[PDB]
Structure formats: structure tokens, C-alpha cells
Amino acid sequence: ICGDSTECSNLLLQYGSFCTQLNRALTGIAVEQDKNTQEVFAQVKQIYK
Amino acid sequence: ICGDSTECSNLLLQYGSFCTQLNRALTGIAVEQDKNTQEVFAQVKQIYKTPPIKDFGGFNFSQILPDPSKPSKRSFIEDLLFNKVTLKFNGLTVLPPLLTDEMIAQYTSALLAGTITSGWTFGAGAALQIPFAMQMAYRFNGIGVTQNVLYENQKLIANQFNSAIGKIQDSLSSTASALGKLQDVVNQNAQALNTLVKQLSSNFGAISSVLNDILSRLDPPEAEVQIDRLITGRLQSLQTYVTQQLIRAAEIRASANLAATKMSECVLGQS
Amino acid sequence: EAEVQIDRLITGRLQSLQTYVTQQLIRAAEIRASANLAATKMSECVLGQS
Amino acid sequence: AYTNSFTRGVYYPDKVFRSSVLHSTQDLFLPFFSNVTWFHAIHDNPVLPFNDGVYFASTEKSNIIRGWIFGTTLDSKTQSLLIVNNATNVVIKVCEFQFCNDPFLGVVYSSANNCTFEYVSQFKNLREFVFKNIDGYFKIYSKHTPINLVRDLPQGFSALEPLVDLPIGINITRFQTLLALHAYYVGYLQPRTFLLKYNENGTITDAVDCALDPLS
Amino acid sequence: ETKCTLKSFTVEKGIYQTSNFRVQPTESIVRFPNITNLCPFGEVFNATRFASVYAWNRKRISNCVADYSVLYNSASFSTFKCYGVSPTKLNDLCFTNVYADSFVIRGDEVRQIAPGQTGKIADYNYKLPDDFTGCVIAWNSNNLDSKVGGNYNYLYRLFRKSNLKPFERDISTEIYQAGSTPCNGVEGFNCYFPLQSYGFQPTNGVGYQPYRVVVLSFELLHAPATVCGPKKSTNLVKNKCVNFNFNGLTGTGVLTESNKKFLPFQQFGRDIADTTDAVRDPQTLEILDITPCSFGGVSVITPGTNTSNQVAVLYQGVNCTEVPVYSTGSNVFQTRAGCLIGAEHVNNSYECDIPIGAGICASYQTSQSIIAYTMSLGAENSVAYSNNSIAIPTNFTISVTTEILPVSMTKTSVDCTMY
Ligand SMILES: *[C@@H]1O[C@H](CO)[C@@H](O[C@@H]2O[C@H](CO)[C@@H](O[C@@H]3O[C@H](CO)[C@@H](O)[C@H](O)[C@@H]3O)[C@H](O)[C@H]2NC(C)=O)[C@H](O)[C@H]1NC(C)=O
Ligand SMILES: *[C@@H]1O[C@H](CO)[C@@H](O[C@@H]2O[C@H](CO)[C@@H](O)[C@H](O)[C@H]2NC(C)=O)[C@H](O)[C@H]1NC(C)=O
Ligand SMILES: *[C@@H]1O[C@H](CO)[C@@H](O[C@@H]2O[C@H](CO)[C@@H](O)[C@H](O)[C@H]2NC(C)=O)[C@H](O)[C@H]1NC(C)=O
Ligand SMILES: *[C@@H]1O[C@H](CO)[C@@H](O[C@@H]2O[C@H](CO)[C@@H](O)[C@H](O)[C@H]2NC(C)=O)[C@H](O)[C@H]1NC(C)=O
Ligand SMILES: *[C@@H]1O[C@H](CO)[C@@H](O[C@@H]2O[C@H](CO)[C@@H](O)[C@H](O)[C@H]2NC(C)=O)[C@H](O)[C@H]1NC(C)=O
Ligand SMILES: *[C@@H]1O[C@H](CO)[C@@H](O[C@@H]2O[C@H](CO)[C@@H](O)[C@H](O)[C@H]2NC(C)=O)[C@H](O)[C@H]1NC(C)=O
Ligand SMILES: *[C@@H]1O[C@H](CO)[C@@H](O[C@@H]2O[C@H](CO)[C@@H](O)[C@H](O)[C@H]2NC(C)=O)[C@H](O)[C@H]1NC(C)=O
Ligand SMILES: *[C@@H]1O[C@H](CO)[C@@H](O)[C@H](O)[C@H]1NC(C)=O
Ligand SMILES: *[C@@H]1O[C@H](CO)[C@@H](O)[C@H](O)[C@H]1NC(C)=O
Ligand SMILES: *[C@@H]1O[C@H](CO)[C@@H](O)[C@H](O)[C@H]1NC(C)=O
Ligand SMILES: *[C@@H]1O[C@H](CO)[C@@H](O)[C@H](O)[C@H]1NC(C)=O
């Protein structure tokens, strides 16, 4: 929403701290996807042939 | 969003009836949590009591059964769990749960005494007494191993059981960080509320974040614009908080339903 | 000035509609979960024995 | 001569009591592990630029380092600040005084042209000071309690508290120390971010920089 | 109120949330720093001697508190005036620096001390610029200056009487070149003698009797202010919902004794989100603690319109020693989740009908009244477990139960341009 600027960056930090929870939610989603895949497939301890 | 100011209410009254929506959603989710706890724990229509004298064929249940010594009548593992995990300013109130802790403890004790003395017969009608060894024989027949095995190896199994329960008690007592999920839930709730109350002191592009001063230093023609900016910013933040709470409530509902299924199936019977 | 007035009205109505849509989505998701549970119950307890 | 400042120069930013809280502050401070221009002025008094407040340290247990001259022209054209010690009375004069080649003072005056304000107030001891001038307010901090973590070098952790504050409202960009007629460090401050851990009684006990290392 | 909030003419059994209450504030307390050193103003307006008009004394007053009320409300001065600001507000004004100009002039010349004025005093003696003037005060000096015998001791810078032509009756010019010599100027052979004298004879007449005039000018916006006026002081009250500014920072709450210990240089403590928690009062130099005034939503427990028309009122999370019919008269019951009025408390226990919180609930079910009791977790029995005893059923029953599940909801489509 700023695109490598200074005035926009100054105006952005005056609106509060929305971006913290935005980034937190996105990172939580990514971690959840990794957990989903690992828990679905990793169900054995050894490797058989 | 007003902080005891008349003209703030005068401006706010023209935005509609959103507050009814917010309060309705919050009351709905609170009632739903109450129903969740009720449906998870209320599974028995009596409260059984274990006999004063205990001889369970050699098994030792002293660390699990409730202790009359503790005034709360909570067992050893309950005390360890409660001591392990550790956790009203401007309109942010917290209501107490309907079911206090002692009632939950009584429910758990009744369930455990019923599943020791009667088996799974109290999950379909009236409790039917049965000696413990002749219940373990049925449970071994349930998995394909003939009952002849149990009666000839009773002492070894009793020692195995006691040693395993001692080891799990020691593991819970010493090793921490095994209770991550509840700690994460508590931390998420506290952090969300804390950031919501932190949001209060942002400028939002107005002149200042203190409303009384901004009124006392100006006149209506532009004080109207400044107050309108502050109001819309605060309302947006509140709406975002409510939506996040709704999502978290849905997730907790799914988890509680799974827990209720597990409690109903793996306790009152055999899976 | 008519443009300013319509701007205010439009932004207000847009916010209201967005809130309504979000609530509808949440309710639909919950109802879908309940429908899946009902389908499981019907398929398992009626066509066989539990 | 140069020296490395281990962890010196942390001060109470404001006048707000706190307890057992980790607080992040964004102000001007002396960065950790910085270069201090150690001087050995025994038998020089160079004039040094101010540049938005300075850290000062000294360890002399006698009456030699007494005054400080502040200004940007050091002439009668514009007012200048004189802050001298007298062992019984601290006199501060912001009036106009003309040029001086090398002052001799200790227990220089040119004139009192356009004089408009004057104020009066009250291992060795490690004198430490921080001088700031911002939005017309002149602030002097201090710490006169010495800590001997190591010898011959200023190591240790301590906090600084305000002593005076003056509404001079003057533009100063240059200063000069004082002696009489016959080993003080220097440091410059930068707009840094710090994380402070308050004690239970409300005293600073730990600080962490935010522009020094990935762990930070 | 329940019918209003629900917007219906009938209500069913249950608990409803109508509105909220908030304890109203009370008298206010205002405080400031303890005491400021008074400047010696009596050495200015009430000195034993003054200066001549051509050498009017100018002095600087700063870095203290100035009380203009005592000199303004006392009718001991002949002429009192102020420009730009009413005198009564000088006790609540702050300025950078104050300049006092004192002299003695005749009675008629007192009207010439104002911006834009003309005359011998204005052009040569006291040149007031055309700008706002702080305050001009004047008082008669016939009691101490002229009566004692000083009828000639004051000189005034009129002009040199050297280089003017007869333009009018009074030969008055602004060409005052000489006058630097302390002997009123030497024109070679005393050709011209400037700096004429005042004839302050007490019996000559009040028209030109000596009058002491002092003019106060204020320095604005050159630097942060150092002098202010006397501020209004009041006492304090405890254990009351009070609004205050308390030496600078506003706040509404209840005061209490505190246990925190401060370092000698703090002013007030906080916890988070700029919420003050402990403050110190400079007059008493004591630390007090702040607690927010109580509030909370109300609720009504009702058995339904059909059965009866009486309800119980529950206040949430308030110690209801002071809540103010259903305000003080009806019976009160303090729970862990607030306190309720209108319903009695019995020691028995039954099944639960209308949940309340903290393990209790209220209904009439086990006479035309609402009773609140502690819910019972169920029945009670003990099974006689013994190591050689079993129980085997002999008869059976078949029971049909019902379960209900929703599977769909209405499909709605909303246009965007139309709405
Ligand atoms: C701080 O530094 C600034 C330099 O940028 C100094 O400001 C300048 O001070 C001179 C003083 O003579 C000002 O000139 C005067 O301006 C007034 C208008 O207010 C005018 O009426 C006078 O005739 C004269 O020209 C000059 O405008 C001013 N410039 C700025 C940009 O402020 C200032 O003196 C320094 N601070 C101190 C305390 O000296
Ligand atoms: C069941 O296990 C508990 C483990 O705490 C036993 O309690 C201990 O028993 C030993 C010997 O009987 C005593 O020396 C300890 O002092 C007991 N613990 C405490 C805290 O007092 C209990 O005896 C076991 N029960 C049976 C029947 O074996
Ligand atoms: C905080 O200050 C107190 C006193 O100013 C320090 O001394 C403590 O005082 C309390 C109250 O009498 C005693 O109970 C403690 O035993 C005292 N402590 C010691 C070490 O003597 C105290 O040390 C300071 N620091 C803390 C963390 O409390
Ligand atoms: C500060 O204000 C107080 C209260 O008006 C003045 O009274 C003194 O208060 C202190 C406590 O803060 C007491 O220890 C003294 O005994 C009080 N003095 C008297 C004479 O009662 C106090 O004088 C004020 N301080 C100054 C410097 O004016
Ligand atoms: C509500 O506040 C009152 C105080 O007005 C509390 O009364 C307490 O009563 C006991 C019994 O004598 C005293 O020892 C306490 O000192 C009182 N409290 C105070 C703060 O003085 C009452 O307990 C409070 N209600 C609840 C539920 O806590
Ligand atoms: C089987 O025997 C047990 C123990 O004798 C019976 O339990 C008692 O039943 C009587 C009948 O009213 C009660 O008064 C006692 O309180 C029961 N004892 C306990 C410890 O609760 C049981 O009733 C017998 N079975 C049947 C079908 O009567
Ligand atoms: C099991 O219970 C049923 C009822 O629940 C008994 O059937 C009843 O028998 C009596 C006596 O013959 C009749 O008067 C009733 O009409 C019967 N009930 C019904 C619904 O038909 C049955 O007798 C019981 N079993 C035994 C072995 O006694
Ligand atoms: C400075 O100190 C000397 C002696 O200590 C004293 O006589 C003198 O008055 C002091 N100066 C001032 C301005 O007080
Ligand atoms: C000095 O103050 C007293 C006190 O009111 C007053 O009566 C008197 O007139 C003053 N002196 C002069 C010369 O005004
Ligand atoms: C009240 O309840 C009775 C019994 O169920 C019913 O007949 C009657 O219609 C009800 N009246 C109202 C107003 O609900
Ligand atoms: C609880 O029982 C005691 C014992 O008699 C009695 O005094 C008390 O009134 C009972 N509680 C209530 C609410 O009546």
C-alpha cells in the first residue's frame, strides 16, 4: 500500500497496528498447512521395502 | 468509542443499530461455549461413590481417585495439571462460567467410579456391579486374546499397570511443555484482548487521541470532522476483533465436538 | 456537492453489505458441517447396525 | 586515542514509574560497543561540535574540570551558555559574552551585553553526564556513584536520572570544556531503539539494543 | 424495558440483557504544585523613591509567580487599566518575561501613556510603541513626594529649544540632538538649556501634582513561559467516584491509599495502554492509587408473560453495597457473579431451569415467587461393590427416541447496483 515511499510510510504508522495481526494470521495459516500435510502423511516410524 | 461525551453520542446515534448486532454475536458465542461444556461433561444422570474399602484384584488406583484430604476433593494429577499451566477497564467485561470447577471435578469422579465398579453397563441403563478381574477378562476377550491368559498372569499385569502409572506421573511432574494447546488458547485470547485495548490510543489521522482536549481546544465546524474520523477508525477496529473472535469460536466448537465423541466412545465402552 | 453526499452514502452502505456477507459465510460453513454429520449418521445407522 | 564503550550510557527516558514490564523506547542513546575519543589533557582543550547532545565521563577527584561553554558563534552577536562550578554554587549564564582564546577559571568574562537571563542552583568517583537540548529545553543528567567492574576502563551497568531542566530556548551546536591557568571521555548520541527491563521497585536493570545483532 | 429491547409485546421464560448502568461521578478536586516563591513586587509599586520621566526605571521580573489579584482588587491606586486582556484573568495567565517601567509625571500626562499617543513624554521621555500594553497603573504622589518638599526634584526631556521656528503657540520640536552630557547638555555658552523641571508644589493644584506611573509589558512566544498567576486550590475527597485534573492529568475514578514506593523524581505510575494507576500530590508529597469507577450491564430474569408478571433484576459483577422498588427495598442476594434483587435464597437444591452463573440458578420449580438456589448435579446412590458378587438383568424394554438435524437453509441473492 506504499510502494517504496516515505510520506506513505509515515502516514501508515499513524493508523495503528493492523499489519501485525495481518502478518500473524498469514503466518499461522502457513504453519497450519505444513502441520496438516505432515500429520496426514507421517504415520510410520520405519521404512519398509 | 465515546468515553463519556455527549456530542460523541449525538454523532454516533446516526450510524444505525450495529451495537445490537455486536452484542447479539457475543452473547451467541458465549451461550454456545456454555452449551459446549454442558454437552461434553453432562453424560451421567447420577453421582456414584466408591466403597470405602478397596480391593481391586491387586490394582492400585490411589493416585487417580479423589482425595478427601484436599478441600477441593481433587486428585494428584488434577493438582499437577492445575499447578503446571498458568495464565473491566473501559467496557471490556469477562463473565464467569456457569459450571464451577468443583462440579466438573465431581462429574469426573463420578464417571471414573462408575467405569471402575460397573464397567460399560452404566452407559446403557442401571449400573451392574462386577468384580474387576472378571471385567478385565471381558476386555481381553474383546480384542481376541482368550481369557485364559489374564487369570494366569494377573500379578505381572498388576505390576505393569502400577509401574506405568508411576512413570507417567513422574513424566508429568518433571517434564513441562507437554500442555501446549491450552497455553496457546489462553495466550491467543489474552493477546487479542490486549491488542484491542492497545488500539485505543492511536491518532487515526485526527489531531489528538484524547477526546476531551480535542473538544476543549476547538469549535464544532471541524471538531465534527475530527470526531467522525476517530469514531470510524475505532468502529473498524472493533468489527475486526469481533470477526476474529467468531472464527476462533468456530474452531473451538469443532475441537469440543471431537472431544465429546472421544469421551462418549472410549470411556463408556471399548473402541 | 452531490458527489460528496453520494460518496458518504455509498461507503456506509458498502460497509453494511460487507458485514452481512461475512456473517452469511460463517453461518453457511457451520450448517455444512452439521449436514455432513447428519449424512454420516444416516448412512451408518439406517443402512446397517451401529 | 580511541576506546570501546562496553555498555555505558542508559538513562531514564521519562518520569513514569513502572514495575516488572518490558518497555520499548525509540529515542537518542549511545549505541552499544561504540567509539569514545579518550583524551589525556594533562601537561589540551579543543572546541568540539555539539551535534544534538553529548555523553561525557570523567574520573578526576579534584577541582579541575569545572565549566562548560555552549554556543554556535561564541561571540557577542548571539547569546552563549556558561555553566561553571564554584564548589558552593552553580551559576548558569545565557547572556552574551565575547570571544575567549583559552579560558582560565576555577576556585574570561568579557561583557554583559544584551544580558537577559541568569540562574543559580546548588578507582575514584565516576562522574557521568548526558547533555541534551531539544525543543528549547536544555536537560542535564548525571551519575556520581562509581562502579568498579573493571579498572582503567568504564565497564559496568548503571542508569542515569535527571537533575535540572531549563527553558532556555537557544540554538547551540558547539561547546568547549574549562580548566584553570597553569582524562575526560566524549561520546555522541544517535536515534536508536532500546528495550528496557524495569525492576520491581522501578529501577532499570537490563537493556537490549535493536540495531546490533540478529539475536538483538 | 425488556419489551422495548426485544421489540415485542410478549416475552418467554429466560434471562435477558436490557441495558447497563454506570456509577455517576461526584464533586471534583483540582490541584497544582505546592508553592512558588513570590517576587518582590512591593519594591516596585510601593518603593520609597522613583525615577524621572526622561530616565524611567526599567526592570525585569521572571521565574516566579505573579499575583495580580491583590493589586487589582485593592482600590489603593488612582488609575488602573489594561490592554488586550481583562485584568481579572491575569491570575490565570502565563508569560515568558515581565518588564516594569516606573516613573513620576504630572496628573494630566497620565492620559498620554498608551499606544499611538503623542506628546513630550511619548516622543522623548517614554516612547511606547504602537502595540498592546500589559497594564498601566498610576497613583497620587502628593502624600509622599510633593508634601515633603520635593517640588522641583524631577526633570523632563522636553526639547533643546534650538532649531525651531514659530509654527504655533507652543514651540515644540522633535530635534533632540544633544542631551548625552550628564549636565543637561552644554551649548558652548549655555545658549540652550534642555531638560526643564516639574513644579510639583502641593498647593499649586491637583492638575499637575506628582503621580507615580508603572507600566507592565509581557513577553509572548519568545520562549516557554516562566511566570504565571495564583491558581485556585481545593481539598481532596476519598472513596468517592471523583473527576479530577490532579496537578495536570485528568481522570475519573476512586482514590485509595497505596503501597508503592517511588524514586524521588517520578510523577505518576502506570501499567499499560497509558492508564495511570498511582499518582503523587505535590502539596502533600504522598502517593495515592486510582481505581476505575464500577459499571456493568443489567439483566432481568423472567418466567414468561403467560405465567406471571413479576421479574428479578441481576446486576453483573458489582459489589452492590451502593446500587442507587427494585433499588433498595426488595431482598438482596450477593452471588459470585454480581448480586440479584427480587428473589429469595433457599438452602435446598433442585434441577436447573434458568442459568445465571457461578453454579446457581433461579426459577419456581422443585408459590408465585422467584427463588434462586444452588443447582444439584443429579441424584445420589452407591453401588455395593464386592469381589464375589454380580448382577444380571432378567427383563428388557424397547424404547424409541427422536433426533433432529438441520441440513439446509434458504438461498438468497442480492443485487449490488440496485441496493
Ligand atoms: C535558532 O537558529 C535560527 C537560525 O535558523 C535563528 O533564527 C533567526 O533569528 C533571527 C534573529 O535576529 C531572526 O531575524 C529576525 O526575525 C524577526 C521576525 O521574527 C524580524 O522581525 C527581525 O527584524 C529579524 O529579522 C530570523 O528570522 C530567525 N530565522 C529563523 C528561520 O527562525 C535563531 O536566532 C536561533 N535561536 C536563538 C535562540 O538564537
Ligand atoms: C498405591 O501407590 C501409592 C503411591 O503413592 C502408595 O502410597 C505409598 O505407599 C508406600 C508403601 O505402601 C508408602 O511408603 C508411601 O509413603 C505411600 N505414599 C505416600 C505419599 O504416603 C500406596 O501404598 C499404593 N497402594 C497399594 C495398595 O499398594
Ligand atoms: C526495593 O526496596 C526495598 C526497600 O526500599 C529493598 O529492601 C527490601 O525491603 C522489604 C520491605 O521491608 C523487605 O521485605 C526486603 O527483605 C528488603 N530486601 C532486602 C534485599 O533487604 C528491596 O531490596 C528493593 N528491591 C526489591 C526487589 O524489593
Ligand atoms: C507544601 O504543602 C503543605 C501542605 O499545604 C505545607 O505544609 C507542610 O506539609 C508537609 C507535608 O507535605 C508537612 O511535613 C509540614 O509539617 C507542613 N508544614 C506546616 C507548617 O504545616 C508545606 O509548607 C508546603 N511546602 C512549602 C515548601 O511551601
Ligand atoms: C463489598 O464491599 C464491602 C465493603 O464496604 C466488603 O465488606 C467487607 O467486610 C468485612 C467484614 O467485616 C471486612 O473485614 C472488610 O474489610 C470489608 N471490605 C472492605 C473493602 O472494607 C464486602 O466484603 C464486599 N463484597 C464482596 C463480595 O467482596
Ligand atoms: C444386591 O445386594 C446389594 C447389597 O446387599 C443391595 O444393595 C442394597 O439394597 C437395599 C435395598 O433397599 C438398600 O437399602 C441398600 O442401601 C443397598 N446397599 C447399598 C450399599 O446401596 C441390592 O439392592 C441387591 N440387589 C437387588 C436387586 O436388590
Ligand atoms: C417384563 O416386563 C413386561 C412389562 O414391561 C411384563 O409384561 C407384563 O406382564 C403383566 C403380567 O402378565 C401384564 O399384566 C402386562 O400387561 C404385561 N405388559 C405388557 C406391556 O404386555 C413381563 O411379564 C415382564 N417379564 C417377566 C418375565 O415377568
Ligand atoms: C564561590 O565560592 C566562594 C568560596 O567557596 C564563595 O565565597 C563565593 O560566594 C561563591 N560564589 C557565589 C556566586 O556564591
Ligand atoms: C503601599 O501599600 C499600602 C497597603 O495597602 C497602601 O495603603 C499604600 O498606599 C501603598 N503605598 C503607595 C505609595 O501607594
Ligand atoms: C398460556 O399457557 C396455556 C397452557 O399451555 C395456554 O393454553 C395459553 O394459550 C397460553 N397463553 C399465552 C398468552 O401464551
Ligand atoms: C442453610 O442452612 C442453615 C442451617 O440451618 C440455615 O440457617 C440457612 O438459612 C440456610 N440457607 C438459606 C439460604 O436459607
Residue numbers in the entry:
A (entry chain C): 742 to 790
B (entry chain B): 742 to 828, 854 to 1037
C (entry chain A): 988 to 1037
D (entry chain B): 27 to 69, 80 to 143, 159 to 173, 186 to 245, 264 to 297
E (entry chain A): 298 to 621, 635 to 676, 689 to 741
What does the paper say about this structure?
The SARS-CoV-2 S protein (hereafter S protein) is responsible for host recognition and viral entry. The S protein binds to the receptor, angiotensin converting enzyme 2 (ACE2), through an upward open RBD conformation (RBD-up); a downward closed RBD conformation (RBD-down) sequesters its receptor-binding motif (RBM) from receptor binding, rendering such a conformation inactive. The D614G mutation in the spike protein of SARS-CoV-2 alters the fitness of the virus, leading to the dominant form observed in the COVID-19 pandemic. Here we demonstrated by cryo-electron microscopy that the D614G mutation resulted in increased propensity of multiple receptor-binding domains (RBDs) in an upward conformation poised for host receptor binding.
In this work, we determined the cryo-EM structure of S-D614G and revealed the high degree of conformational heterogeneity mostly confined within the RBDs. Multiple substates within the one RBD-up or two RBD-up conformational space were determined. Collectively, 62% of the total population of S-D614G had one RBD in an up conformation (one RBD-up), including three distinct substates that separated the RBD conformations, and 38% of the population had two RBDs in an up conformation (two RBD-up) with two different substates. The three distinct RBD-up substrates in the one RBD-up class showed a 39 to 52° upward rotation with respect to the hinge defined as the Cα atom of the beginning of RBD, i.e., residue 330. Contrary to S-D614, we did not observe any all RBD-down conformation in S-D614G, in line with the previous study of a similar construct without the transmembrane domain, but differs from the full-length S-D614G that exhibits significant amount of closed, all RBD-down conformation. Compared with the wild-type S (hereafter S-D614), the increased propensity of S-D614G in the RBD-up conformation implicated the facilitation of the binding to the receptor ACE2. However, our cryo-EM structure of S-D614G showed no appreciable structural difference in the proximity of the mutation site with respect to some of the extremities of the reported S-D614 structures, including the first reported structures of S-D614 (4, 5), the acid-stabilized form of S-D614 (22), the disulfide- and proline-stabilized HexPro-S variant, and the furin-cleaved S-D614 that adopts a more open conformation. Meanwhile, Benton et al. proposed that the loss of a key salt bridge formed by D614 of one protomer and K584 or the other protomer due to the D614G mutation leads to local disorder, thereby increasing the dynamics of S-D614G and more populated RBD-up conformations, a finding that could be confirmed by our cryo-EM structures. We argue that the increased stability of S-D614G could be further attributed to the increased configurational entropy manifested in the higher conformational heterogeneity of the RBDs, which contributes to the free energy gain of the system.
